[PDB]
């Protein structure tokens, strides 16, 4: 099945909207991690392929995803990076987990019906 970008946007955008609707949980994920601003010079030692909601949104908006799995991969990349870098005791890690739960719940029926 070849998907039109507009069909992908239509189908997938609500799952991204669900992530943004999580407040305050999505707030650390809405822009790329800035290690200079945050004083964390080892961030890019640990995280080689950064990802965040703004990047995912731009890619969906501009039709960069050919297939739904590619979107799903970038969402999980974002989550995996945050789980890798941050300690499980941290607020950011727990918020990562909350967003991943919401994502799993929302993406499931969407993938089925694609
Ligand atoms: C709304 O939730 C938060 C709001 C602020 C915090 N923060 C603190 O509690 C301590 C001060 C720094 C701040 C904060 N920590 C961030 C961590 C990340 C991040 C992620 C994701 N993956 O690895 C790292 C590292 C990202 C942002 C963090 N911030 C603030 C939240 C919003 N900003 S910003 C100004 O760059 O857009 C920085 C953390 C959380 Cl979970």
Q: Quick recap of the structure?
A:
It comes from Homo sapiens (Human). The chain is mainly alpha-helical and 114 residues long.
Output the number of helix runs: 6
Mind telling me the C-alpha Rg?
14 Å
Overall strand count: 0
Give the proportion of residues in helices: 55-70%
Strand percentage lies at: under 5%
What is the total domain count?
A: 1
SSE pattern, N- to C-terminal? HHHHHH
Major sheet: size, sense and barrel closure? Answer: none
The hetero compounds bound to this protein are: ligand EL0
Which class do the helix and strand fractions yield?
A: mainly alpha
Shape: globular
Taking the alpha carbons of the first and last residues, their distance comes to 9 Å
Protein name: CREB-binding protein
Region (Interaction with ASF1A): 80-98
Domain Bromo: 3-110
Region (Interaction with histone): 42-88
Write a structural description:
- The protein has about 110 residues and is mainly α.
- It has one domain.
- It is built from six helices and no strands.
- It has helices spanning about 5-20, 35-40, 45, 55-60, 70-85, 90-114.
- α1 (about 5-20) packs antiparallel against α4, α1 (about 5-20) runs antiparallel to α6 and α5 (about 70-85) packs antiparallel against α6.
- The termini are close together.
- About 15% of the residues are buried.
- It binds ligand EL0.
- The ligand COc1ccc(N2C(=O)CCC[C@H]2c2nc3cc(-c4c(C)noc4C)ccc3n2[C@@H]2CCN(S(C)(=O)=O)C2)cc1Cl binds near residues 37 and 38.
- The ligand COc1ccc(N2C(=O)CCC[C@H]2c2nc3cc(-c4c(C)noc4C)ccc3n2[C@@H]2CCN(S(C)(=O)=O)C2)cc1Cl binds near residues 27, 34, 37, 82 and 92.
- The PDB classes it as protein binding.
- Keywords: Histone acetyltransferase, CBP.
- It forms a monomeric assembly.
- The entry is titled "Crystal structure of CBP bromodomain liganded with CCS150".
- The protein: CREB-binding protein.
